[PDB]
Structures are given as structure tokens and as C-alpha cells.
Design a protein around this ligand. Structure first.
Ligand code: JWO
Ligand code: JWO
Lengths: 305, 305
């Protein structure tokens, strides 16, 4: 019983983190087989952070300008390239601790674990979600660039995020591991604003199902509703619209609790119109939207890796 | 910027988890050097879960009845003992992946990371606190016994908790690694109730300091107060009383924000008397008490391991 913001075990990623230095900037790289991956802005200097031409800045750099350390060790760069917004440094030694892995580009509403690193050393692990506006509400300090986000499927690590920057609003932006940013953000010191951040409806429903499984029943009601009529209420409160694919993704939880999806939508509707009245659900006093339906089943059914 | 429930990287503990079977019960053990540690109730059977005599049950068991697996491997038990409520199984192979470690018995209000395991395989990692009534509000399913809680200090793992059981109220109880329970709980299927669960005041203050560091300023007020007068308000709302040691532990955060401890107490007092008025602090709609002063500085100053 119980329900917590649970991250994946980080062991397999810990072994992959290295420190990357170009001139005087030091950030984190990801060492997989014989390639090190890091944000390309490692090659920036102070004055061209406003509008750097990375291609131009790269002509003035050779293999030996990039210093890669894995712990106290030193690795030899024998090649370098730029793929969108990440650098790929080819090194002489394949990581002995490379796990089975793949690169995935996740969708908004999806969640992942973040291993926050500084100087190539892991500091902590937490869960977060890709928000509908393609930011993440992370916990990152100066130096955290190149930290990565991942999901684990048994023995296989799926890398989905590499941290690049903080926006002046305090939320965070980054790329997939092919270096394409999530959202419309660029790796420059310009005015970049996030759009409207709406609530991930299918995740809130999943979280109500978890509450039910754990015995928290007070919000369930007599009412039912329709997809169209719920989405009317969703739009006034800035909730993502619910589709039949979302209804289908909720099937497993519906089956376990005996509660149909549309009856749970009816319960959410009342909580949006009348609030929670100083009550709490699963220890929280607001509707939580960073647990996916899969996050819920894994926590309340015990999937291992 | 940002603030999340952050756990320690779990790599060093992952390598220590093994599967322990006695007859037909399978739970998790902790393999450190040539000893495996697990809850002694692994030797229970169905009918004597009401009141087992562990000493008696142990006379009918020899080394070869205990099966220990580390992954697909099998380890040889060459000795066994009972220390309070844990079994120590002596095996023929020292764990090659033993980290530097120590056993610590933590105090209420202190926090740690939990690696939830099933069948000796890690499932997820999260943070929790030892509550003032010596329970923990964890996330554990059947099979999770023997999962451990730990803090990390650079390279050294401090083990503080081993999970033993769930109470019928849904919270969790366990031992230190010397097998002495936290609280008055016993490893039997009897009516065991937790006492009053009060709020950890020094942790709430620490969390207000984190909010300030992250720019969340709206709760700060003109008032100040006194230790005695704050504790009057604390007792009506079931908050732990604040001592001068607690004031001193908050010194670093006070120094960083320029805000004296007693002025922050004045702000907490108003939030207890008038509530938060539908506002939120650090994304939460209630006062969070599972971050210690050290948790805060580590997150908002970047300690690595
Ligand atoms: C990458 C690193 C380690 O230097 C860093 O911490 N940060 C960063 C990221 C990108 C850049 C440029 C502008 C693309 C070169 C510089 C610095 C900071 C960060 O993003 N600061 C931003 C704040 C205002 C807008 C411009 C830069 C960082 C700080 C906290 C969390 N993540 C990243
Ligand atoms: C240990 C294990 C893996 O069998 C288990 O999951 N649980 C458990 C713990 C202790 C016991 C005895 C009674 C001491 C032998 C039995 C089973 C359960 C658990 O604690 N169930 C309790 C619920 C009602 C009171 C008696 C037992 C468990 C379940 C969920 C989370 N943690 C532990």
C-alpha cells in the first residue's frame, strides 16, 4: 500500500556519466559504447552566448581540445561531430558498463526519471513529466547540463532527454539524444518563453484510480457523464482534451477497480467545479498529473527490472 | 532552480540486493561482504504468523535450508544466526560489489532513500521520512520485505532501515540493520496501531526556506514571534515543538536567505492559523514536512556523491 513519486533505479545510468571539458566549460556527457554525447553549447564562450554560430565555432576546435573524464580516468577523443544540438565525441575505449539501450523521443504527458549530475558525478534521481508546452519542471542547478532522463524496461534503458538549459521562468528545456529540442527552444541566451501549461487529464484520472486502489474513496460520486460534456469542463479549466485512446489506455485500471472511465471523469468534473474542500487525496491537496497510467500499474502491481 | 522529492542514486545498493528463500517464502536480503541480512520472519509458515517463537522455529533449520540467489547465481550458506529481528546468513563468497558502508539508527524526522525490491530485483527508488510515531509512509507491496533505506555520504552508504511489514492502517514498520524495530512494533500478525503522527516542524521551516530560494515569497510577513509563543501554536496544530538545536540546524539556510529563523516561524504561524487560501508553495497546496534542512541545502547547493 502507499503511493510515492517513484523513480527508476539509476545504477545503469550512473555508470554512463562522464565529465566533458572544452576549454573552460565543464558539463556532463553520456558515454555509450565508444561515443560520448553532450550538449553542443559546451564549445561556447562568454561573449557569443547571445547568438553563437556553432558550425563556425566548431572549425576552431580539434579532437584534442575536448577533455573527457570518467571518474579519475581520461579518455582519448579520436573524432568529433555535431548532430543537431548535441556533440558526438568518438573515443578510443568502449564503456565496459554500457547497458542495453535505445534513444526514444517521448510525447508530452509522458514521464521519465532524471539523474541530476554535476562534474560528471550523480547527485540525485527524481521523476518528472514532459509538460504539454514541452518544458519540464525539473530540479537543476548551474553545472547540470548534459544530465539525462530515461525509462527502464527490464534490462534496456530508453534515453529520452538531455538537459540543455533553464528558462528565465525557472522551468527547463532540452533535447532528445539525437539533439532535437523538445519544443521551440534554441540553445542561445535570448528571451524564450514557454506557452500555456495545461494539465495532463489522462494522468489525473490514472492518479484517481491509484487513490481508489489505496482505499481513498471520498471523491467518488453518483454521477456519470459523456466524453464531449467532460471535455467542455476540461477546456474551461485548461485540461488536455480526453480522447478514446486515453480511455483505452485507462482500461487496465478500470478493469482492476470495477469503475468505468466515464464515471471517473464524472468525479474529476465535480472536483474541478467545487474543489476539494480542504480534503486531500493520496496525501496531496491538489490534483496530481505527473503519473501516467503505466506509472500507476507499475507502482500498484510491482513491476521489476 | 526547481525543487523535487529527490532520492540518492541507487547504484551502490542495487548491487547488494539478493533473493532469500526459506522453504517457500521468498524475500529480499542485503549482501555485504560475506553476510546476507534479511528479516527473521522469512522462517515463518502460515499457521504460526499469529505468535511465532523464532528461537524455537530456528532449531528446526540448518544452513542448507536457506537459499540465497544474487541474480541467477547461487550462494552457499555456511552459518546462520539471529540478531534481534534479523537473520545473518554467512556465505562462502564476499560480495565483489560491496560499497563502503555503515549501519546507522536514525532519529524521527530524519529522511532516507528506499530502494523497493521484489524477488531480489530493484523496482524503484523514492524518498521518505521516519515519522515521529516511528512508522514510515512508504510505497511497498507484498514481497517487498527486506528492501532497505539508506543515505549516501560521498562514497559511503549509511544503511538505516530494513522493511519488515505493513500495518493494517497502510503505513510501514521496520528495523535498523541490527534488527531492532523502530517504534514499539513486533513481527507478528497482531493488532498493532500507530500513535499520533505529528508534523516535523523543523522540516516545514526548511521547506519554506527552499521556497524562498526559488523565488516563492508570498507567505513572508511583517510579524516576528518567540520560541515559546510559536510552540503554543505548534501544539494546537500537532506540530513537533521547536528547540534551539532546531534553530541552530536552520542556521545555514537562514544565512543564505538573510531571513532570521524566528521571522520564518512567524510566517508558518500565520499559515497554520489562516491556511493557504487556495495558494500553493513549491507546487504544493499543503505544508511539506519530509525535507530536512540538509535535504534542502543539498538540492539548492548541489552536493555530489
Ligand atoms: C550548461 C551550464 C552547465 O553552463 C548551465 O548550468 N546553464 C546554461 C545553459 C545554457 C547556456 C547557454 C546560454 C546556451 C550557453 C548557459 C548556461 C544554466 C542556464 O541554462 N542558465 C540560463 C538562465 C537564463 C537564460 C540563459 C541561460 C542552468 C542553470 C540551472 C539549471 N539548468 C541550467
Ligand atoms: C514479508 C512479506 C514479503 O511476506 C510481505 O509482503 N508482508 C508480510 C510481512 C510480515 C508478515 C508476518 C505476519 C510478520 C509474517 C507477513 C507478511 C506484507 C505484510 O506486512 N502484511 C501485513 C498486513 C496485515 C498485518 C499482518 C501482515 C506486506 C504487504 C505490503 C507491504 N509490506 C509488507
Amino acid at each position: 500500500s502507499g503511493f510515492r513519486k517513484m523513480a527508476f533505479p539509476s545504477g545503469k545510468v550512473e555508470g554512463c556519466m562522464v565529465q566533458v571539458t572544452c576549454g573552460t566549460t565543464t558539463l556532463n556527457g553520456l558515454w555509450l559504447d565508444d561515443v560520448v554525447y553532450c550538449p553542443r553549447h559546451v564549445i561556447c564562450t562568454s561573449e557569443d552566448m547571445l547568438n553563437p554560430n556553432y558550425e563556425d565555432l566548431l572549425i576552431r576546435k580539434s579532437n584534442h581540445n575536448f577533455l573527457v573524464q570518467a571518474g579519475n580516468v581520461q579518455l582519448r577523443v579520436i573524432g568529433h561531430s555535431m548532430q543537431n544540438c548535441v556533440l558526438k565525441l568518438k573515443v578510443d575505449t568502449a564503456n565496459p558498463k554500457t547497458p542495453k539501450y535505445k534513444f526514444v523521443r517521448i510525447q508530452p504527458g509522458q514521464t521519465f526519471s532524471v539523474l541530476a549530475c554535476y562534474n560528471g558525478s550523480p547527485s540525485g534521481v527524481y521523476q518528472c513529466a514532459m509538460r504539454p508546452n514541452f518544458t519540464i519542471k525539473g530540479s537543476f542547478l548551474n553545472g547540470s547540463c548534459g544530465s539525462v532522463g530515461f525509462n527502464i524496461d527490464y534490462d534496456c534503458v530508453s534515453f529520452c532527454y538531455m538537459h540543455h538549459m533553464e528558462l528565465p521562468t525557472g522551468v527547463h528545456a532540452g533535447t532528445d539524444l539525437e539533439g532535437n529540442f523538445y519544443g521551440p527552444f534554441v540553445d542561445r541566451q535570448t528571451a524564450q518563453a514557454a506557452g500555456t501549461d495545461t494539465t495532463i487529464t489522462v494522468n489525473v484520472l490514472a492518479w484517481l484510480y491509484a487513490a481508489v486502489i489505496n482505499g481513498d474513496r471520498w471523491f467518488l460520486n453518483r454521477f456519470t457523464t459523456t466524453l464531449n460534456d467532460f471535455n467542455l469542463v476540461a477546456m474551461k479549466y485548461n485540461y488536455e482534451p480526453l480522447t478514446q485512446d486515453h480511455v483505452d489506455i485507462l482500461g487496465p485500471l478500470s478493469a482492476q477497480t470495477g469503475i468505468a472511465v466515464l464515471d471517473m471523469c464524472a468525479s474529476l468534473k465535480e472536483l474541478l467545479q467545487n474543489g476539494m474542500n480542504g480534503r486531500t487525496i493520496l496525501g496531496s491537496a491538489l490534483l496530481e498529473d505527473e503519473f501516467t497510467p503505466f506509472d500507476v500499474v507499475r507502482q500498484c502491481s510491482g513491476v521489476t527490472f
